[PDB]
């Protein structure tokens, strides 16, 4: 009766004219005939249509269009990784998938605390630039006569060449989805604060600390991950020294608090002191 859609994939307009093509397509996952919806998110947009069944949509809490999760807008991998949940059991076969469907007809995503991981790795404002014309394939080959009139983007494709071959079923299930792979390697580096070649440096530098955070407040921060050798304030730099007694505790404190944690609101950075 209404698509299950990412609210980015409805564009800025509070009013939406959308075309409703009942039996307009086959679900890109369950291969099922379903009701397609087509619309132009905004004036700079193209016409996007739903890509999957409504059920196959609301199973994995993903948009019918972008196949991204509905709460955070990250691919189904990145959300399944932060959800920590098992690999997809759902049958890849379509005899299997339709059998699972016809079963579930005749007779876990809404009750989770907001994962900081997903929240940390998500876009603040909407990726409206995802609702925009493809790139003019005749502009690429240099043979576009349509001039600036082309409804297609007059730019060249600037994309990872292992990407641009993404599979629907794999972006919906979560297997070898190169975009979420790139994203998790990003978070792998950001979760990779370099523990230096010096093994004995047992201090962590805490920079960017706004003044209302006190030294015992950052002590309340860092006591959990190991014994503190000494904590040292200097508000002139808005920064702090924290030395521990064991290296692995400062390793813990880097690994958990490297991806920019916020102590009582202050966006603070960690470095190996």
């Amino acid at each position: 009766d209404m698509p299950i859609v990412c609210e980015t994939c409805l564009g800025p307009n509070p009013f939406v004219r959308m075309q409703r093509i009942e039996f307009g397509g086959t679900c890109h996952i369950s291969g099922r005939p379903y009701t397609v919806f087509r619309w132009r998110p905004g004036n700079d947009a193209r016409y996007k249509k739903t890509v999957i069944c409504q059920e196959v949509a609301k199973a994995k809490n993903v948009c019918q269009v972008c196949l991204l999760d509905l709460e955070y807008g990250l691919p189904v991998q990145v959300r399944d990784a932060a959800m920590g949940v098992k690999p997809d059991e759902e049958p890849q076969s379509e005899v299997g998938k339709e059998y699972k469907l016809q079963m579930e007809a005749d007779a876990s995503y809404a009750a989770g605390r907001p994962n900081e991981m997903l929240q940390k790795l998500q876009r603040s404002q909407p990726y409206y630039k995802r609702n925009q014309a493809r790139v003019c394939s005749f502009f690429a080959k240099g043979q576009c006569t349509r001039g600036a009139e082309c409804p297609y983007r007059h730019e060249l494709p600037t994309a990872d060449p292992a990407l641009a071959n993404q599979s629907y079923k794999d972006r919906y299930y979560g297997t070898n989805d190169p975009v979420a792979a790139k994203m998790l390697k990003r978070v792998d580096e950001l979760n990779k604060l370099t523990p230096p070649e010096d093994t004995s440096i047992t201090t962590l530098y805490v920079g960017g600390v706004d003044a209302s955070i006190t030294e015992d407040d950052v002590r309340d921060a860092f006591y959990s991950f190991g014994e503190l050798a000494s904590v040292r304030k200097m508000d002139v730099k808005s920064c702090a020294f924290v030395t521990y007694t064991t290296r692995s505790a400062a390793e813990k404190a880097a690994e958990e608090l490297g991806g920019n944690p916020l102590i009582k609101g202050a966006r603070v950075k960690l470095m190996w002191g």
Partner: peptide, 18 residues
């Protein structure tokens, strides 16, 4: 519908439907 859809649609700024 059309008037509000095109006050926002074309002009950028329109009335909230709420």
């Amino acid at each position: 519908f059309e008037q509000q859809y095109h006050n926002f649609h074309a002009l950028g700024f329109g009335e909230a439907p709420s």
